Amino acid sequence: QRIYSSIEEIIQQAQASEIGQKKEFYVYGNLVSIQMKNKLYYYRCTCQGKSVLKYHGDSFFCESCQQFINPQVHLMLRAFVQDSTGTIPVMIFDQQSSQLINQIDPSIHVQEAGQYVKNCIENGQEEIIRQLFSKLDFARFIFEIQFENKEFNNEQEIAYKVLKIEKENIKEESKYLLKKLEHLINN
Amino acid sequence: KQMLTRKEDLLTVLKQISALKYVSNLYEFLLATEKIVQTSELDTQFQEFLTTTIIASEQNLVENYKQKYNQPNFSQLTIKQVIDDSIILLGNKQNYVQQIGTTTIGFYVEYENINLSRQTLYSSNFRNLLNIFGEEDFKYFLIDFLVFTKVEQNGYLQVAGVCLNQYFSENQYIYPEIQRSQIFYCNHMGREPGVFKSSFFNYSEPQTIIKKTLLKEYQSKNFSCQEERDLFLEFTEKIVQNFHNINFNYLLKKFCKLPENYQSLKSQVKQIVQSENKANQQSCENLFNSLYDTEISYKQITNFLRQIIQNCVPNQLLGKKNFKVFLEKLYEFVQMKRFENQKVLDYICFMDVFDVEWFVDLKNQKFTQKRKYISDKRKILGDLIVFIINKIVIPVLRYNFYITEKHKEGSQIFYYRKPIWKLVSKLTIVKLEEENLEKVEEKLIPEDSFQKYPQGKLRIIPKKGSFRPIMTFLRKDKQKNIKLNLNQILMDSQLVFRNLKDMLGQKIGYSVFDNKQISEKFAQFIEKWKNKGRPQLYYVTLDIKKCYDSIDQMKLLNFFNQSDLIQDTYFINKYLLFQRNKRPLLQIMDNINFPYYFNLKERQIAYSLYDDDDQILQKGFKEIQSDDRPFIVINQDKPRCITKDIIHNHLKHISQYNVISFNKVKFRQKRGIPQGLNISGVLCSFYFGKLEEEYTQFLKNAEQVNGSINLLMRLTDDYLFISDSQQNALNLIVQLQNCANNNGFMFNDQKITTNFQFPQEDYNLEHFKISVQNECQWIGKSIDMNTLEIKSIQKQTQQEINQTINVAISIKNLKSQLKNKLRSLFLNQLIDYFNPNINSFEGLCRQLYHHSKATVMKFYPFMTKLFQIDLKKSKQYSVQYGKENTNENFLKDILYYTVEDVCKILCYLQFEDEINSNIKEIFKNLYSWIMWDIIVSYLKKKKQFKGYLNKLLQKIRKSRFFYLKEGCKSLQLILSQQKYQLNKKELEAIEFIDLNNLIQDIKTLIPKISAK
Amino acid sequence: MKLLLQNQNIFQKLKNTLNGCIKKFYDTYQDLEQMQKFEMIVEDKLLFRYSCSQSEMFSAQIQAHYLEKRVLQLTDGNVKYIVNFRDKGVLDKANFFDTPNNSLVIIRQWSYEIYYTKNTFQINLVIDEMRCIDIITTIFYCKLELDFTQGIKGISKSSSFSNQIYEYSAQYYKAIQLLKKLLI
Amino acid sequence: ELDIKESLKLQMEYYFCDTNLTHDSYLRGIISKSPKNCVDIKVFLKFNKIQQILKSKKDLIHLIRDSLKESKILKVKMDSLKVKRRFPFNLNCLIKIINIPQGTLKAEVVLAVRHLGYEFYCDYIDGQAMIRFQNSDEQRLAIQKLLNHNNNKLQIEIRGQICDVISTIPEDEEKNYWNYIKFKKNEFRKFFFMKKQQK
Amino acid sequence: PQITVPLNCFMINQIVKAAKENPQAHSGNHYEWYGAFENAIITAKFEFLQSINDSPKIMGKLSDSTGCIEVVIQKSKMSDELPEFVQAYEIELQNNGNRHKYVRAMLKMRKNAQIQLLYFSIVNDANEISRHGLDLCLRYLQRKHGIE
Amino acid sequence: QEQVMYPRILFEQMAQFRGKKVTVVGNVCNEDQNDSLVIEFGPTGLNQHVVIDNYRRVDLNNTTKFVEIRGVVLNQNIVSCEELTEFEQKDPFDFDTYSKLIHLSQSDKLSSLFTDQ
RNA sequence: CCCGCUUAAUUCAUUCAGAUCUGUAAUAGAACUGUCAUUCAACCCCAAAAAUCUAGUGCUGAUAUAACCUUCACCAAUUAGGUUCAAAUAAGUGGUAAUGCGGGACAAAAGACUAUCGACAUUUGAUACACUAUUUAUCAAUGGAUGUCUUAUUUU
DNA sequence: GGGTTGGGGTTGGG
Ligand SMILES: [Zn+2]
């Protein structure tokens, strides 16, 4: 069996943590408010190309492999994972975002989700993407949340990243609330 | 006709934009929707707010907001709750003014950044507006409309609606770019002539190695099949093999060889380097001059490059005729200026695809679809041409020569052999060490400044008899976690100093920074001079030598510390500014947008936390306007902070620990601040203003003690003084000399230019070389001492004019580029000194005559470059100008519309809105005729224009003359109707028109304006 | 935002103001009349008031306030301060957008106040003028704090966790020692 | 010498005289072919009597220029080699594809058949399309590829639909088609006669 | 210190009654139940109420095992349509032969004003009832023990 | 505009009440096949069958698998039906956690928020 | 002017750094090796102008005191002589290129051509393929096209 | 596993 913790405990433990510490949790929560103000995707090679050489006319060339590659689009989303107790900002990477898009729209295939988003954005169809992202509001899931205490540009900061997303089933959540309440009443 | 007006309203301008179907102020909208009635009473300030606020929408929604009898309007929520409800109603939309500085999380809105426009939204006026509207209508009014609230006499602030900057917003093949910029400024030298050891020519010593080094070109997608790749690889193998048989020593001796007295120059340089005592000035000037006359001519280098290419590249790689075309274009590649470059289509469009024999087509498209085959093979020909130039030509030029520009030669390009430049560098390093540079060791510099700031580089530009060092701070250190160069580190302190720059204008010295300030000072002095009665005038001009290197660091830091003009803490605001352009409003083809009338500029400002008069905290901007036309500002959510202590640390570091590099050797400045930093210009002016106010007390009270008019201005290191008394000029010279003696600086070349002559023995001025001239020349402006009129100085020959012009032309946007180029060329410097308060009518006409004569010569190379492209092969231009004479029609259209726009701008600058329209039309026609006469006279001799186009130009000129005469003829009858009463300026204009007899001809006025 | 408040360097302003207050108090009471010195020492009344200069202006975010005791809490990044304000007029003059909480303010002038209580000297910080410039609803988790409403014990706390608080506490103790030496 | 140069100049003037240049017109074509009626000395270098008057070619050019300098009929300036006057002085096997879909354009089918790479003639009628080659051997050099030997079917791809063709048209029909070609030639001749006879 | 809190109809009625009976509180819209809260979470069955001459406001009903409350649903003004989450309820109600079902509803309530309903989702598993009850009790205990 | 109390009870408290306006919840029974609808309590390991007379078994939706009713108990194992809702549940309904929740709601400490007094 | 072909040989010089050799008063001689670069190169301040340029003219009636035209390299500034809304013949500088060899009769108003061609050649259109300054294919309509000979003697 | 904003264009004063 796993251990489930609320958002407030994650917030309190993240602040006290020293620089360079990591820990993982499991939370019952609902996703809300995916943000689209920044760029929604980036480009990486199949051989894990650290540096992608930008060119003109949709031309590309990886440096970790040294071949003419078709650019591969990786989808990154920022949203908020909020429980009844609290709210935290999280980052959603390619696999989980593709899973969410496939769940909300079964027609799009898993790895094709990034291509679909890129085509919709570039062709001039942003209303469809807005409607697609709006249907994910207040959708309950099971999350694996990891916080990292790291320093960027000589500035201490905490970043939350989601590792796994699972479908919700009320039964063990109800059992967990019951046992927590029983422990509280006992003490 | 449509004319530019000095006064406009935002409501009138907004009605000219087709997107907005409803434009009105808030009061008339409130009455239109029956929210308020005229019998109701309101506060006077609330009434003013309702009257001045301007709203607009893309559709008419007056019906939707009509007052409903179902339920009245009472407010119980707070303004914040209503605004939050509106922002939540916005949802996923991301571009709204009220959304700036905040994010939405479900049904909660979080405020996280400083927005200076929230003070307007959360003000009492908007509370009263909410009371008037009601929540259910306020929440949608904030979204469906664009709300502009007036905060200044002509400035407006958008606080709601879609941001204005959102209105200011199948692929095709793009050819590669020639990397011509690589040739410049190479200091590396090798033992044996050739190319760098990292080039693929020297790495090889089979097909495997050449394939490995040339991966970028071997696996291109333009190759149809593997056979083409194999043929190209074999060609590259042959190229590499042939290159090693070139005797570079013989080629360098034959075409571009060293001087016959090279050994004497080398011996002289060595003796100067080794000698302990200081070298003679005249001998070193002669040595520098002799070194700089060893430059290689363009023909010599073109022959050298052609010889290299002919025996290194097989003739069949490009074709028998394509090779010759490439060789011929190589010369035009060689002689280009600093910021000029070639294009691949400059070679491709003159070549034949079918000339290449080794091209193979997988599918028989040679006969079926010839055009597709031609496109596909052009894609390969362009790659081959790029490969030849970038791999062979550029590295050889970079390795065997030092290519740079001189000091007063503009953008002209010069080539120097590498040993000559090594001698020059040795001599320059010897000269730099004695005065201001010393060799340094990294042990002395502490590690904090070593790991916090990046270092600079040194570059040498030849000068006649000397050099000109420039220090560049572009680099950033990958190690030590540095991601910015030094200027980017010092950017915010530059904003603080720019804040300091405004007070320097009048408070603590005589400093000028731009043309508007100089023009205002001249206008004030001219008014005082006219009031006095136009007496005789005397002027003195002198300048400081090496102002940046003559600054004492301790004095500069002491001045910085004890000055109260720089506050302890500053905040930084960012905002977008929309300002009217110089385009008149069209009077009501259907697609008219905001960019047609406004210019978008990104601005930053530093403000203090004190309760200052300017009260930037309420607005967030500080703009100076020269007219009554409106402008719009929208704030941004990126605030920053900067403290005086941080600026002090930056100044201390740059003054004490500046380290620069030259040929893998580190140096360090010993005195002064480096030129090339963004903060040095203001610091120099501040430092010299302190001394000049120390030593110029007598000027302050002289305007009242003895009643003498005098003007003193200083731009950087240049001084100008115009006075009425000779004693004042002599005293100023003596006082400035005393200040220079006491503060350790000196004036350039020991020269002073004056209007009079005085005995120099009495004032210990024997070492000065006084030059007497009757016509003042200052910062490129020519000033007359009798009539006191100012006009710029123009070059006289085509060769001198060409040196400062770089031509860049693209087929996609010929029309816009050429029209904007003409507009800038006419309006570059004439727009600042066309003041009616400085010059008279004849002076303005003469100024326009000379400026237009200069601008036509400036623009001439663009017209010749245009004729190198035939537009009959481009549908975009042939559909509009035909096929027979496309180029001539295009050029005529551009010239006509540009001249018309320039004339309109000139009339806007000269007259006020109160002047009668007939006078304005007459003067516009006169200016148009002057410019067209200049153009026709200049172009009537050229062979390219000799035929079809000159007839059209002459017709235009004749039409302008006829229209001017007709307007002058009808003006008499119009004025004789007595319906108009004429003021002083109108009477002056009538007198000017009648004196020169513009009714008949122009031959009376031409002698006065053409006089040189 | 947090970087904006850190660049202010409020601790330098506090140190300068405390140094000026101590110097002025030392200069103004050199009479050293024993009867007057004994008269001036009574329970629960202020002895001196030094207003800060115009150069000690900073901005902070209000996290909480208390009308009953006139205690106001200010935070900027790492450090949160607990100070007082003169009266409700200070809050009414500052045109708050919605509420005093979660609002960014500029303190135009403040002052140090010296009080003698329980056979020792207590130095307070009182805010006189405030100006609201925006709303910032962003929770800042301040690890460390200093309290100006409890005397030496409220300031010396969490001194080991930060060098700046250690230096300011040393300066505060030196000021208290000098005050008790001169007056008593 | 001076006399030799004078005689050569006289000979050149006689050869460049207006009266002589009309009857002969040997050098008149050279004059017409000149850019701006400025002929060089290469034309006179092929002469027999002019060369015999000579009794390093730049020296000969300079001598000719000196000889013609004092003359007025011709012109010489800048010590150039060219010359000019001072006056104008002007005055078996063929197949048919079958079962073409109705409404198919001629361009599509002619493009489809031209993929072989040799010229021919095509006419489209309802379905039937006669194609004729210019030489005998292209038929056999093309039937090796236009016949898909993998399927062994006389099939050609037109408009994305499979079309059929016969390898040999009937002998009577080829005779009729040759007679049709002869009839077309005769009708062109008759039209040519009519065009001549409208005047 | 948390604006969102889960509680049922009886607690809504008790809070409103207590606030109205003794209005001697701070001059703010916020209620007072072991702190200040704006939002609420409740699982109860939903049914439309057909009011008269009320176009902008649509009256609903949220009955539960403890009591009942009145809620109002706002609609867009630029055009006359219904929110998506309630259109889904309407179409499902039409499809299933007019059978009312429990919903998980989040509603924003302020004093001296009606109770807006912001969003709800139809629930088909009876385990949500026990989950909601346990969550209500746990959060109530947490709030009471955090006050002290 | 009306306050009606519908407290939740278990199977054993049903005899303790003996007539009150309450609500009960259970899985629908189909093996007995009465004319009147019969619902069942517990995980079916122990037999607890109650029948409602107002509501017919066949009229409700076929996909319905779980129901809860609100009505006064007519007699032991007979409950009148006033309001009935339909739950189409694809997962088993846990009865132990529901029993614990009911017992905690009936407790003295937490009864204040659930019911008056 | 166009076209065909060819156009030359040993070092003018060798910075910086490393490592050998010989000589001896710090000078110098000899030979050898590695080599753009923090993987980038690119000075700064102030000021001027800014359409998504298939979109824009009183499309122009004028001052023989005017506007054009003509010169054996090209191009651009300096003098004479003519003509009247468009036409043919000139005189001094500055700057830039200049290898040899071979060729340069269709001038043309035509005639005889029944030699040639639905596979000739244009003309405007349409349809495809192409478009950043493409050198095409088919169709429709339509009438001329190609070649040779005749008004012809290398003092050319 | 992400990360100021890189330009584009190049005249005239200092
Ligand atoms: Zn790769």
User: Do A111 and A25 sit in the same domain of this protein?
Assistant: yes
Q: Which residues contact E130 (CB under 8 A, 6 or more apart)?
A: A174, A178, F94, F97, F98, F101
**What's the rounded Cα separation, in Å, for the pair B1002 and B998?**
6
Closest in E99, E125, E134 to F89, CB measured: E125
Chain B residues with CB-CB distance to A37 below 8 A: 94
Closest in C3, C97, C136 to B112, CB measured: C136
Name the residue with the least CA to C1' distance from nucleotide G7. Answer: B307
Name the residue with the least CA to C1' distance from nucleotide G11. Answer: B249
Among the listed residues B585, B592, B551, B567, the one whose alpha carbon sits nearest the alpha carbon of residue B500? B567
Give the SS3 label for residue A155.
coil
Among the listed residues B1005, B924, B992, the one whose alpha carbon sits nearest the alpha carbon of residue B960? B924
| Tokens of residue B771, six digits | 């030059």
Q: After which residues is chain D broken (C to N over 2.5 A)?
A: 55, 91, 126
CB-CB contact of D166 with D154 (8 Å): yes
**What's the rounded Cα separation, in Å, for the pair E29 and B135?**
15
How many A from CA of A55 to the centre of ligand 1? 15
Among the listed residues B257, B26, B44, B58, the one whose alpha carbon sits nearest the alpha carbon of residue B144? B58
CB-CB contact of B983 with B916 (8 Å): no
* Cβ <8 Å between C134 and B80: no
Residues with CB under 7 A from strand H: A 42, 76, 91, 93-95, 146, 150, 152, 157, 159, 161, 163; B 339, 411, 484, 488, 491, 681, 715-718, 779-780, 792-793, 804-806, 808, 821, 824, 828-829, 858
| Tokens of residue B321, six digits | 């005729």
Give the SS3 label for residue E45.
strand
CB-CB contact of B402 with B418 (8 Å): yes
C1' of G135 to CA of B215 (Å): 33
Question: What residue numbers bound the domain in which A129 lies?
Answer: 7-40+76-186
Question: What residue numbers bound the domain in which D57 lies?
Answer: 2-85
How many A from CA of A65 to the centre of ligand 1? 4
Partnered with residue E119 across adjacent β-strands are E106
Nucleotides of G under 7 A from a protein CB: 1, 5, 8-16, 33-58, 60-63, 65, 67-69, 71-77, 88-91, 96-97, 100-101, 103-107, 114, 117-119, 127-139, 143-144, 152-156
Helix (H) or strand (E) holding A141: strand A139-151
Give the SS3 label for residue B481.
helix
CB-CB contact of B472 with B675 (8 Å): no
Q: Which residues contact B193 (CB under 8 A, 6 or more apart)?
A: B248, B249, B252, B399, B400
In this structure, which residues have their CB less than 5 angstroms from ion ligand 1? A 45, 47, 49, 62, 64-65
Chain A residues with CB-CB distance to F100 below 8 A: 178, 182
**What's the rounded Cα separation, in Å, for the pair B907 and B924?**
6
**What's the rounded Cα separation, in Å, for the pair E9 and E43?**
9
| B307-336: b (≥16 Cβ within 10 Å) or e | ebbeebbeeebbbeebbebbeebbeebbeb
Among the listed residues E50, E123, B597, B500, the one whose alpha carbon sits nearest the alpha carbon of residue A140? E123
| Domains of chain E with CATH codes | 4-147 (2.40.50.140)
Helix (H) or strand (E) holding D129: strand D128-133
User: Do A35 and A106 sit in the same domain of this protein?
Assistant: yes
Phi, psi of B881 (to 5 degrees): -115, 10
CB-CB contact of F50 with F77 (8 Å): yes
Specify the length of chain D in residues.
199
Q: What is the DSSP letter of D136?
A: S
Question: Which residue pairs, CB below 8 angstroms and at least 24 apart, start in F85-89?
Answer: F85/E45, F85/E99, F85/E100, F85/E101, F85/E102, F86/E96, F86/E99, F86/E101, F86/F60, F86/F61, F87/E101, F87/E124, F87/E125, F87/E126, F88/E124, F88/F61, F88/F63, F88/F64, F89/E124, F89/E125, F89/E126, F89/F65
User: Do D76 and D103 sit in the same domain of this protein?
Assistant: no
- Residue C1 CB-half CA count within 13 A: 20
User: What CATH number should be reported for the domain holding residue A113?
Assistant: 2.40.50.140
Phi, psi of B395 (to 5 degrees): -60, -35
| Tokens of residue F68, six digits | 């809860």
User: Do D107 and D78 sit in the same domain of this protein?
Assistant: no
CB-CB contact of A31 with A136 (8 Å): yes
The runs of H, that is alpha helices, within D16-100 are: 18-24, 28-33, 49-52, 57-69
Cβ contact B–C (≥3 pairs, < 8 Å): yes
Task: List the resolution, Å.
Answer: 2.9
* Cβ <8 Å between A171 and F91: yes
Q: After which residues is chain B broken (C to N over 2.5 A)?
A: 169, 205, 588
Name the residue with the least CA to C1' distance from nucleotide G116. Answer: D185
CB-CB contact of D128 with D100 (8 Å): yes
How many A from CA of A121 to the centre of ligand 1? 25
Phi, psi of B998 (to 5 degrees): -75, -5
Question: What residue numbers bound the domain in which F18 lies?
Answer: 11-114
CA trace torsion E117, E122, E128, E134 (10° rounding)? 0
Given CA atoms D54, D60, D63, D69 in this order, what sign does their dihedral have?
positive
Chain F residues with CB-CB distance to E10 below 8 A: 113-116
Given CA atoms B121, B122, B124, B129 in this order, what sign does their dihedral have?
positive
Chain F residues with CB-CB distance to E122 below 8 A: none
C1' of G78 to CA of A98 (Å): 80
Q: Which residues contact D194 (CB under 8 A, 6 or more apart)?
A: none
A6, A173, A179, A182: which to substitute to probe chain E, counting the most E Cβ within 10 Å?
A173
Residue B564, annotated as binding a ligand: no
User: Do A34 and A47 sit in the same domain of this protein?
Assistant: no
**What's the rounded Cα separation, in Å, for the pair C132 and C100?**
9
**What's the rounded Cα separation, in Å, for the pair A108 and A90?**
24
CA–CA distances in Å: residue B470 to residues A60, B260, B660, B677, F111: 37, 31, 11, 11, 85
The runs of H, that is alpha helices, within B678-746 are: 680-694, 697-705, 726-743
| Tokens of residue C81, six digits | 């301060």
Closest in B94, B172, B216 to A36, CB measured: B94
Number of domains in chain D: 2
Closest nucleotide to B485 by C1' from CA: G38
User: Do A96 and A134 sit in the same domain of this protein?
Assistant: yes
| Tokens of residue B119, six digits | 């003070």
User: Do A30 and A101 sit in the same domain of this protein?
Assistant: yes
**What's the rounded Cα separation, in Å, for the pair A174 and F19?**
31
E26, E30, E78, E117: which to substitute to probe chain B, counting the most B Cβ within 10 Å?
E78
Strand intervals (E) in chain C = 46-51, 58-66, 71-76, 79-85, 103-117, 120-135, 144-147
CA trace torsion B314, B316, B317, B319 (10° rounding)? 130
Among the listed residues B633, B601, B599, the one whose alpha carbon sits nearest the alpha carbon of residue B619? B633
Q: What is the DSSP letter of B391?
A: I
Phi, psi of B632 (to 5 degrees): -125, 140
Chain A residues with CB-CB distance to F104 below 8 A: 181, 185
Indicate the domain borders of chain B: 1-162+576-633, 182-258+294-404, 796-1009
Give the SS3 label for residue A51.
coil
Residue F5 is assigned to a structural domain of this protein: no
Helix (H) or strand (E) holding E47: strand E39-49
**What's the rounded Cα separation, in Å, for the pair B817 and B865?**
13
Give the SS3 label for residue B347.
helix
Residue F1 is assigned to a structural domain of this protein: no
Specify the length of chain C in residues.
184
User: What CATH number should be reported for the domain holding residue D147?
Assistant: 3.30.70.330
The domain defined by B182-258+294-404 folds into: Topoisomerase I; Chain A, domain 4 (1.10.132)
Phi, psi of B100 (to 5 degrees): -75, 130
Phi, psi of E46 (to 5 degrees): -115, 140
Number of domains in chain C: 1
Closest nucleotide to B959 by C1' from CA: G60
Q: Is A184 on the interface with E (CB under 8 A)?
A: yes
Give the SS3 label for residue B866.
helix
Single-letter residue type at B149:
T
The runs of H, that is alpha helices, within chain A are: 7-16, 94-104, 112-123, 127-134, 170-186
Q: Would you tell me how many other CB atoms lie within 10 Å of the CB of residue F71?
A: 20
Q: Which residues contact B203 (CB under 8 A, 6 or more apart)?
A: B209, B213
CB-CB contact of B492 with B572 (8 Å): yes
CB-CB contact of A143 with A173 (8 Å): no
**What's the rounded Cα separation, in Å, for the pair D188 and D174?**
21
C1' of G109 to CA of D196 (Å): 19
Closest nucleotide to B824 by C1' from CA: G49
Residue B448, annotated as binding a ligand: no
**Chain C: closest CA distance from residue B118 (Å):** 7
Phi, psi of B625 (to 5 degrees): -115, 140
**Chain A: closest CA distance from residue C106 (Å):** 25
C1' of G121 to CA of D187 (Å): 18
* DSSP character string of E75-118: --SSS----HHHHHHHHHHHHTTS---EEEEEEEE-TTS-EEEE
Cα angle B25-B26-B27, degrees, rounded to a multiple of 5: 95
- In the block, residue with structure tokens 């190198």: B868
Indicate the angle between helix axes B644-656 and B553-562, nearest 10 degrees.
170
**Chain B: closest CA distance from residue D171 (Å):** 32
**What's the rounded Cα separation, in Å, for the pair A66 and A46?**
12
| Tokens of residue A170, six digits | 């009320």
User: Do A103 and A114 sit in the same domain of this protein?
Assistant: yes
CB-CB contact of B199 with B411 (8 Å): no
CB-CB contact of C113 with C123 (8 Å): yes
User: Do A103 and A154 sit in the same domain of this protein?
Assistant: yes
Q: Is E45 on the interface with F (CB under 8 A)?
A: yes
Q: Which residues contact B590 (CB under 8 A, 6 or more apart)?
A: B18
Question: What residue numbers bound the domain in which C38 lies?
Answer: 2-183
* Cβ <8 Å between A174 and F91: no
User: Do A166 and A99 sit in the same domain of this protein?
Assistant: yes
Out of A51, A75, A99, a domain closes at A75
Give the SS3 label for residue E59.
strand
Q: Is C109 left (phi over 0), alpha (psi -120 to 50) or beta?
A: beta
